[PDB]
Paper text:
GORK is a shaker-like potassium channel in plants that contains ankyrin (ANK) repeats. GORK, also known as guard cell outward rectifying K+ channel, is the only outward-rectifying potassium channel in guard cells.
The full-length AtGORKFL forms a tetramer with elongated cytoplasmic regulatory domains, with its architecture showing a symmetry reduction from four-fold (C4) to two-fold (C2). Remarkably, ANK repeats from two neighboring protomers form a stable dimer through specific interactions mediated by their protruding loops, creating a buried area of ~1,500 Å2.
Numbering used by the authors:
A (entry chain C): 206 to 308
B (entry chain D): 58 to 615
C (entry chain A): 309 to 615
The structure:
Amino acid sequence: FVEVYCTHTAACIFYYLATTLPPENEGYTWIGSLKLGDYSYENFREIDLWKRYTTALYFAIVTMATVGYGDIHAVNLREMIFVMIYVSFDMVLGAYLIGNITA
Amino acid sequence: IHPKNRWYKAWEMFILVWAIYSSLFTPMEFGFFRGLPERLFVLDIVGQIAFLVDIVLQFFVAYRDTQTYRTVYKPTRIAFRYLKSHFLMDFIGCFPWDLIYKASGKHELVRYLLWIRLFRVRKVVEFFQRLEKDTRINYLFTRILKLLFVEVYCTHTAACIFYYLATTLPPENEGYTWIGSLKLGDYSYENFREIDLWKRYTTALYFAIVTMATVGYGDIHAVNLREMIFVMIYVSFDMVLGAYLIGNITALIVKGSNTERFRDKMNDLISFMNRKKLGRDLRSQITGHVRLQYDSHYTDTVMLQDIPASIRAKIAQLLYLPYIKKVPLFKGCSTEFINQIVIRLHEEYFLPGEVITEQGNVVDHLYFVCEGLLEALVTKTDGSEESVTLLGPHTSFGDISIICNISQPFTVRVCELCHLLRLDKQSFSNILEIYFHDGRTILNNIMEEKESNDRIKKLESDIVIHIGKQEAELALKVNSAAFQGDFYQLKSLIRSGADPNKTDYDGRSPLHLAACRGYEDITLFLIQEGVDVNLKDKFGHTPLFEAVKAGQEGVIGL
Amino acid sequence: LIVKGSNTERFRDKMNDLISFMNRKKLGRDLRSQITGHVRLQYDSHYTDTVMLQDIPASIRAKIAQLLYLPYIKKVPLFKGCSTEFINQIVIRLHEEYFLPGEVITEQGNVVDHLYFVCEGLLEALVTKTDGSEESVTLLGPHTSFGDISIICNISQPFTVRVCELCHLLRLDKQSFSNILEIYFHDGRTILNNIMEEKESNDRIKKLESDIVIHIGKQEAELALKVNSAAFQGDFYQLKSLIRSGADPNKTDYDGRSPLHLAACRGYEDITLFLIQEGVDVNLKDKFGHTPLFEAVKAGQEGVIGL
């Protein structure tokens, strides 16, 4: 449960980090530059909240799943370090889960 | 300088700060920046002179040799071994090579040899070896901390190596280089060299961590074949390191805590208890008993094997001195006897409803109910509903069964949670026979609670016969001591309370024996003691007869 | 591999456990934290010994101890025993210990239950005094023995021993020594002769020479007296245990009376018969010159006279 909550908060803070930059240089931040499957949602603010939540959460537990499709990238420098920290903490936590189940 | 010093300790903290700074710094000069700025070259020479001061202190450390287990402060041997161990390696790194690089026209050989400064990480790892030595932190917890630190250090070094290899390629082929053509987002890192050092540092480290956490992420991939081979080695190393991390985390928690073991036994015991469906007080009784046995076992074993007799003696003294002093029977005897009793004590806890020894069995330990209330009963296999004075806290019991050598004249049972003291027969008997004065004192105490304690009054016949035998043997002892002079010993036993009036079995009174031997000093000492002069032996011989028989005029005159 | 662990892991784990327990006992951090630490390191070597000794069927360990422990004691002039069959038993019950500097083994004036032989290392032995200042009567050395003389004397041994160098000592329980002595009384006589030789030879035993002489003078007195008393009361178990402890039935009391005389005057039959089995003499003359027959017919017991 604590792991899942950590993932959710990671997704939320990640979307906020995307929001940090002004409307200009929308391409420079990760959102608005994906253009996956012809959706090309450049203007994230215009898009309804639910889809944005889905996309951010997907990336958060895909990094969590230690799989990494690579559709979404931490392109900007500002949030770039955030994925670093999040994945490291995730490594420790996943290892702890493996240890607990092994016990 | 000496290792056990405050200033020494304050020195190594600065040493390790400088050490981690230089350890991280070495990749910073090797990659992300060709050459060095004069700005940081100053910090470089500052760190190098700090390392020189460190190596000067390294010259004289007076470390303790492991084989000796005793510190040696002689300079020459400390030099001969410790300098060879570390100073030789340190010396190469100590020389600042940025100047040589500039003098040699930034020759690649100098940069390759610059890696020697990385060797100082040994001081950092030695610091954590000392951290591990501290008892407070968990061993496996310390180990996992070490693994995390080492993993981070290795990953950062790989990230720096990635850019150094990229810059090693000629500037013309920017596209073929990975950083030249990675194009993250709308922005393109077309020129790695002109973009800020940090902008490149962030991207290179991100690539290394992506592999370390095993999430591929697509995104950046090695483009250069030179880049390709390095990635292979890095990931191969990282897999085993992460595997070690998994194993250590598993092993840290596979060790069940004392609470964990206790809860496991609670689980299976309540499962069985529910099978029977008895419930009620019984569940509580077993639960309390089992938790108490864990707590007691914790106490017992560490005393049994971890701590030697001399060492355990001190803690026994501190823990049990008031406990033994409070007991009335032990009061009135010399201090050394009390200490001897204390330093061969044990620990016992008990619950309501348990019998330690049944009536008629041979007693094997001496007990004192320090805490709680206990019921002593004369209930036996043949007969029931027989009870005697309840034993309160700080009351000894079983002393009558041991001193009088009677095998448990009653059944002793505990009635609630009590704290009990256990002590063996052999050591107690030896202590008693060594210290007879304390033995009489205690027996006089036994006389004191006589006709005041029902249990003692019931068994008082055994104590009476025991004191009769003790007085008989004491009379024999004083007669023997008077035989071989021992004027001081006779005086001491008089101070000990020995009655000179008592005679031996032969009727040989101390005056009789003094006359027979002819020691007039003993004769006058017994005279001023107050014993009647006219006495008879088994055959009725008066001391005048033996005084004449021996032939000394002094005893006859007295 | 990690879960299997190492002896170091158990070492640290037990460190944590009893350190936590001592902290819950609120013991002083300066007083014993180091001592526990010091002894703890030496225990690391001996845990293997403990595991083997519990595991082994006790014969092979006897052989290995014979290989190693026997030479050390043979080197020691003290406790030679003047025979080799007797010493190997001592080896098979013998245990070993390491130490750290500035450590006190035995406190003054305590009943000793552990017998220490300095197979290796240097020791200093000092005696308490009324002033309390320590006086080092002797400096002990490798392949020596201390505290055995105390058991021979039965004295409280008011001696403090402090290590002066790296040392290996052997720890022996008093009871095992008593048992081996009762098995071999003659070897006890031989070691008594060896001890009376050292009393001239060595300073510490020369310091205790007054005690050695007095108690040897004393010890005989109780032995003859005690058997006579136990013959007087007639308790057969105690007297026979004492007489099989090494007491001489022919030894006489201060008046010269024998346990046979007291048994006859009391008139008990089984004591007299047992003493007959012991080859007790009858021609013995007391200060009054009494013979067992005389008091046997004085008291009036037919069985003793008939025998």
